[PDB]
Symmetry: D2
Subunit: 247 residues, 4 copies
């Protein structure tokens, strides 16, 4: 016997056509939610719609464009009459690694535009429709890089810290309206180095791990969870193992 942990819920998932987003689309759909996929990869997005069927729709959305975000939220509410979950998952990386001496102003702005501005716009317009409902859940995909240095580039790390901080500040403002705000912060595998240097040996981060954290946070199981940075990194961001490794 099985259960639908999101029955009747309406969820928007940016970056939903691939990776963590698509995993969360499939999982939310499995748990009875109507899912709006928001992305810029129309071929992938529409394919998920054809696979899963009527409860899933695709909308082209550049999250850095406020008009796209407005259309995304407004057509979803028009379609389904309500918005329960805004999952600002879309993200990009400027580089795997690199020095501050070599970062370009334009790359930093591109990473900020998608990661921070997009999540900001997504939260603004979800709050726009959620506040009159007196209920809702706003989620962000942050990153373990927001909890510890040495995991990402300076631009990416700065952008993800900003998301976590935006998360806490929105939980403070929107709590008065019954709206919960949280984020999920994964380690890697958005495997070789990650699994070897990771803290939890014998485990590997899979996209489903992030989706399942988002599912918990988005469900009524998390009815009193707000302001939480739900880190999914096997404990990587709580340790500096330089001593253990040298003992």
């Amino acid at each position: 016997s099985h259960m639908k942990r999101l029955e009747g819920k309406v969820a928007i998932i940016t970056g939903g056509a691939s990776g963590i987003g698509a995993s969360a689309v499939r999982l939310f759909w499995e748990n009875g939610a109507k899912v709006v996929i928001a992305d810029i990869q129309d071929d992938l997005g529409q394919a998920i719609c054809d696979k899963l069927g009527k409860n899933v729709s695709y909308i082209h959305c550049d999250v850095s464009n406020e008009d796209d975000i407005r259309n995304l939220v407004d057509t979803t509410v028009a379609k389904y009459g309500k918005l329960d979950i805004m999952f600002n998952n879309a993200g990009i990386i400027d580089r795997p690694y690199g020095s501050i001496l070599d970062t370009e102003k334009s790359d930093l702005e591109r990473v900020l535009g998608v990661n921070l501005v997009g999540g900001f716009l997504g939260a603004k317009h979800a709050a726009r429709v959620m506040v009159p409902q007196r209920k809702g859940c706003i989620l962000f995909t942050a990153s373990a890089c927001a909890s510890i240095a040495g995991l990402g580039t300076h631009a990416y790390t700065a952008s993800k810290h900003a998301i976590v901080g935006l998360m806490k500040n929105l939980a403070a403002e929107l709590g008065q309206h019954g709206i919960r705000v949280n984020c999920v912060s994964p380690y890697g595998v958005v495997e070789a180095m990650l699994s070897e240097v990771g803290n939890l040996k014998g485990a590997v981060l899979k996209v489903e791990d992030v989706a399942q954290a988002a599912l918990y946070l988005a469900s009524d199981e998390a009815n009193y969870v707000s302001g939480l940075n739900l880190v999914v990194d096997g404990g990587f961001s709580v340790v500096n193992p330089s001593m253990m490794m040298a003992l």
Copy 2:
């Protein structure tokens, strides 16, 4: 093409010990873990209450008298559990006490601080040590603590209580670092919940903390769905500990 949900027995096959399991959060978690297919050992010092849960829930739930500050009690709790079921999957160090709901450092008795520490910190220490004893040779396991939202913000608990729960968070993270080498996850759940005032001054309007909220956080952490969650302080407080609302309220 047809949605199929999550299986209702998320802890099927797992063996879990819940200290403080005879009332409150612990009893809520016992019932929820039982509903999810776990074998559950209630560890407490309220024997009549704990056995009444077992009589209601049946054979998958048993009771063990355990003062968590007593290492012999903890050792026996872990050892009887392994003898009964062959393994230990989840060690939920939930038992906790308070010296007072509130009070000044000037009033705080040394003996009260020590009793709060014995149960909350030393007991959690002992429970983790003996869970790890059997858990390291399995190369798997989940060790949990009930900490408190007062480990994330001041103004919510007494000094003794708040200090003991910070210690638990620190212990959780240190243990996540050591035992991760053996595949073992370590996390805590930090609940918000004088109770009438906590509900009025909470950050999340339109909802009140109920013990099932905490049980659900513990279920998530204990489940294989959280297989890459370690070192996490899972706060369940509606945002209370992320905000100083003094100036919001002065606008």
Copy 3:
């Protein structure tokens, strides 16, 4: 005395506020001080007041050309750069809802607060790494430690600065460079489009009423003193530190103590 003897420091936003306090304090402690700002009259006034050891450069911290010139001119003047204090910062509003926050406002705040900090750290690192020494400082804010204090755009940008500061502490520690930030309470902003002086006064007045540390009021000197400790050799092993100056506001939710 003279905790910064012979040291060369750049202070963005140095013509007013905390920046101007830090300019004076560093100068009293023997530093050469380059003021970087866009209030030319105010900055030249300070230069005329303090003498040869203090100099002014018109600098838009969001402009990389400006930052590149500010660093290189400083090096050409004094042959080294010891302290880069990325203090310039603006708010969009003293308070306000996410629902009426404008994209352009967020982008403007990011441009000064985050991109300007990024650019300042980049060009300081360019000359400090060969030195195998240097100290890079940011003025963040107490709102990077607690919600309820700044707007969403401002708070996000200051969290971003704290993250940058820690990430730079990890990269630049290998070269002997320390990176820290100071995070004050109160309302902290230079001149900015649509920043009312009435609204700032009203909020600064409320913040002094609801502060945690009674009997004291935060002054610009308090923040300058924190920057001076961090910049001095007395902080030789201090890096990655968010030095919060807020009287304890960000560690407490006093809703229970108030209601009791």
Copy 4:
């Protein structure tokens, strides 16, 4: 020059290590310093060397009667107490597994580190609340900021201290009293300890520098002085950035 002129400071653990470094440094900046320790001979040698503005009180910080005597005599000597520096601390081991931690060892580390700080802040608050002024300091540890650095018993006790510091900052701020801690990187048998200190200096984040006791005393001096008049609730970490980074990825490249 003298950054603590007129101030009266108690420094537990003041006869050696960080405590003795702070005792010297505070005295050099004009403070009256009461050394509180259980190394009577070392502590009295400091007093003889520095003169009558420095005194010694035998005090086991886990004993309340010792703590009360310490505070009360200090106030009797000088009429006030400005700074309560709860610096005394012990480790159980340099490093070890949870599997071999002994209950008694954990209780002893808690007794000195946490209960001692608790008691010292209690009786300091007793005298500074009527003054409507004071600064209460703790020596915590960088291992309260990151895992992998201290043993479980030590780390738990220093986390507890950081949380006590913040909770006191909240209660006592209404009386104008500031509460902060300093959290040093170093480990601070003797060879056991030196081995780990040497290893810490090899794996530190900040290259070209080593933590010295004077670094920690300097952080305490800043926090104790009027230069930090609006600093409360602060965990002043002194660790060259070690606790903000996991270099595992950097190092594998």
